[PDB]
């Protein structure tokens, strides 16, 4: 179930693959996880003692994963000790073309292979159970930036407790500070 691009697995990836095998055997979602696979996994520390698991899955299987996302997250959170498990796709980053750039520019860089596009996709997939309805960027007096993300009100109760782990994951991956809010209505 683990097929890393570098072909080198680790202990956490092995354990999560074993958990996925257990879910294949002991649950009703056999075919889905049999067809699907993951690329990598990682763990980070956020919220002053809380731990978050990040599951890097391939892009051509992200849509199929989203079908079971909620149930799979529940099963993983029940199998593991109290953590926060999030599934994120595997986006490649291509460097910006330059005058000194070599034959790596033999093909035009797709717009999807872009830092901004990849960051937007990561943010969108990070909070998948709730849709994004608005985005604001505040530039502080010292020059720093803060990103405010508005989430859907109809799914507030589902992900209201995971906001801090989202702000930790995005800071660990993208490197930016982000906050989440729930506007009243439009």
């Amino acid at each position: 179930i683990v097929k890393p691009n570098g072909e080198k697995p680790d202990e956490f990836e092995s354990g999560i693959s074993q958990a996925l095998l257990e879910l294949e055997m002991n649950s009703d979602l056999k075919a889905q996880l049999r067809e699907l696979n993951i690329t990598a996994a990682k763990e980070i520390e956020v919220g002053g003692g809380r731990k978050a698991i990040i599951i890097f899955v391939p892009v051509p299987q992200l849509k199929s994963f989203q079908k079971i996302q909620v149930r799979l997250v529940r099963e993983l959170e029940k199998k593991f000790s109290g953590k926060h498990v999030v599934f994120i796709a595997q986006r490649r980053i291509l460097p910006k073309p330059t005058r000194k750039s070599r034959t790596k520019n033999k093909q035009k860089r797709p717009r999807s292979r872009t830092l901004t596009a990849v960051h937007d996709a990561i943010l969108e997939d990070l909070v998948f159970p709730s849709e994004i309805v608005g985005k604001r960027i505040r530039v502080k007096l010292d020059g720093s930036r803060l990103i405010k993300v508005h989430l859907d009100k109809a799914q507030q109760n589902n992900v209201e407790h995971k906001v801090e782990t989202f702000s930790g994951v995005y800071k660990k991956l993208t490197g930016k500070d982000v906050n989440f809010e729930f506007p009243e209505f439009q």
Partner: protein, 149 residues
């Protein structure tokens, strides 16, 4: 404002912020593409196809569902007209005005409107030549216009 009128209207469409397909929509990409193919085979321009899909099948935006525009889908399938629909409509309107004008020699307003329409046709033809959609010898001539459309 308008290219050839003093009017400065603001009426247009405003797409929603969200790009995600609504939950109630049961149609898949392949089913939408099959509907598009059937409508195109029936002889409908992409604009009419989009209007029908919006009005009847609850398809707000095909590009949101199938990830592609109507014209590109038709070109990939091969069911695409030789010349673009907007240029076709402009040439058809010019032909209609010219047919009216030959029986009414004293209608100077028709002559003015025909001049405006032909100017727009020349603009669009030059733009399409720039993008190589038309061969760099395609010309709009009044006599040929009837056979063109």
């Amino acid at each position: 404002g308008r290219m050839h009128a003093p009017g400065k209207g603001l009426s247009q469409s405003a797409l929603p912020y969200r790009r995600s397909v609504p939950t109630w929509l049961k149609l898949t990409s392949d089913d939408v593409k099959e509907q598009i193919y059937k409508l195109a085979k029936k002889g409908l321009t992409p604009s009419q196809i989009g209007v029908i899909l919006r009005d009847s099948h609850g398809v707000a935006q095909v590009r949101f569902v199938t990830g592609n525009k109507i014209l590109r889908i038709l070109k990939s399938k091969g069911l695409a007209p030789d010349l673009p629909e907007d240029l076709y409509h402009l040439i058809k309107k010019a032909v209609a005005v010219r047919k009216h004008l030959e029986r009414n020699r004293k209608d100077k307003d028709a002559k003015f409107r025909l001049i405006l329409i032909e100017s727009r046709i020349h603009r669009l033809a030059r733009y399409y030549k720039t993008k190589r959609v038309l061969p760099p010898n395609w010309k709009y001539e009044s006599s040929t216009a009837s056979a063109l459309v």
